[PDB]
Amino acid sequence: TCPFYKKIPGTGFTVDAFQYGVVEGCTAYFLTHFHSDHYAGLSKHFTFPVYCSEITGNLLKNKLHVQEQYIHPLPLDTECIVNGVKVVLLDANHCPGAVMILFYLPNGTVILHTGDFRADPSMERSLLADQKVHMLYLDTTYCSPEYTFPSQQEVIRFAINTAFEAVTLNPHALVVCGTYSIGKEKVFLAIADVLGSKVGMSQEKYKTLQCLNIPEINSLITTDMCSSLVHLLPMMQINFKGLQSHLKKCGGKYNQILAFRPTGWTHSNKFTRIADVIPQTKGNISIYGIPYSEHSSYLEMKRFVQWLKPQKIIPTVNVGTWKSRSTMEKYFREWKLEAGY
Numbered sequence: 656t657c658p659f660y661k662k663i664p665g666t667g668f669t670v671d672a673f674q675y676g677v678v679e680g681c682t683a684y685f686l687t688h689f690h691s692d693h694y695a696g697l698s699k700h701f702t703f704p705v706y707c708s709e710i711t712g713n714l715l716k717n718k719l720h721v722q723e724q725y726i727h728p729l730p731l732d733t734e735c736i737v738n739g740v741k742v743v744l745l746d747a748n749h750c751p752g753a754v755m756i757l758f759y760l761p762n763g764t765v766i767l768h769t770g771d772f773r774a775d776p777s778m779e780r781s782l783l784a785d786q787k788v789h790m791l792y793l794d795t796t797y798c799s800p801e802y803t804f805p806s807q808q809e810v811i812r813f814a815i816n817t818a819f820e821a822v823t824l825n826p827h828a829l830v831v832c833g834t835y836s837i838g839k840e841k842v843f844l845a846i847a848d849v850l851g852s853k854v855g856m857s858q859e860k861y862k863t864l865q866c867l868n869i870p871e872i873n874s875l876i877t878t879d880m881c882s883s884l885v886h887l888l889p890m891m892q893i894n895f896k897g898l899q900s901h902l903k904k905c906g907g908k909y910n911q912i913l914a915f916r917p918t919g920w921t922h923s924n925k926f927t928r929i930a931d932v933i934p935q936t937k938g939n940i941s942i943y944g945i946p947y948s949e950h951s952s953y954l955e956m957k958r959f960v961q962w963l964k965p966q967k968i969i970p971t972v973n974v975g976t977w978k979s980r981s982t983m984e985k986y987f988r989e990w991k992l993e994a995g996y
């Protein structure tokens with residue numbers, strides 16, 4: 656059974672609700688982004704209207720085989736009428752094709768559903784500037800002040816400089832980057848660009864990347880691993896065993912691996928500055944965990960909500976424990992008393 660925080664009152668709509676069978680009264684299912692916790696349940700047999708971005712629709716058709724007749728892609732930043740209700744899709748600053756959804760209810764209520772997002776001051780000049788929001792359905796993934804991490808631009812600066820130094824010292828070093836979903840593509844694209852290389856990967860991963868509308872993609876990626884000195888592998892293989900195994904397959908071309916594991920937040924963020932980060936090393940293999948987040952930090956979240964001044968907040972993450980729910984409600988009341996709304 657579909658939980659309440661995935662239903663949109665006064666409409667036939669649900670958000671990210673595909674794992675519950677047929678939802679009673681649902682005339683249109685919205686999908687905010689192509690991540691498995693959110694699409695859980697969709698397949699080629701799905702027969703109801705799905706509303707999403709163009710990029711998410713490309714992935715539904717090619718990776719999950721959903722039939723074309725049930726995919727309804729909408730442009731961003733554009734007022735659209737769906738089943739007699741005005742909606743707008745906005746860029747969520749999460750993974751490629753991820754959106755927030757503005758719903759203008761027939762009774763005059765305005766609701767914002769963030770999906771998953773990384774809040775940014777640029778959002779304060781989207782179509783959100785214009786008007787009041789009565790209800791915010793909020794991505795609360797890192798809603799506590801201990802969750803700190805650097806900007807994505809600082810993290811990429813660190814990765815490019817680390818890779819370029821290593822390979823200039825040793826031209827026979829291979830660079831490997833881990834992946835398990837869409838998102839974080841800048842990590843491996845920025846490294847391959849500084850090294851003058853295409854990125855090499857499996858046929859399955861190449862197919863996924865070909866759905867993303869990235870400009871000049873055919874100039875940046877390949878399935879010919881022998882032509883590339885930046886390889887992608889599943890995240891599960893980014894360990895000394897899996898990396899040793901990979902290096903054997905490379906035909907004596909390389910004598911060293913430098914690997915990157917993009918993570919979200921980890922507890923070493925509570926102590927160690929990005930500049931000071933060091934790898935784990937075994938012999939000729941080194942592995943860097945880098946904190947490249949596609950979710951809001953606590954401070955980014957707080958800024959966005961204090962700017963928006965919503966009348967009511969419904970969290971969509973960390974909702975399963977009483978202790979989590981109580982902590983989140985305390986910070987929402989602080990924010991409101993501090994800013995005066």
Ligand code: NI
Binds near residue numbers: 688690749771
């Ligand atoms: Ni996500």
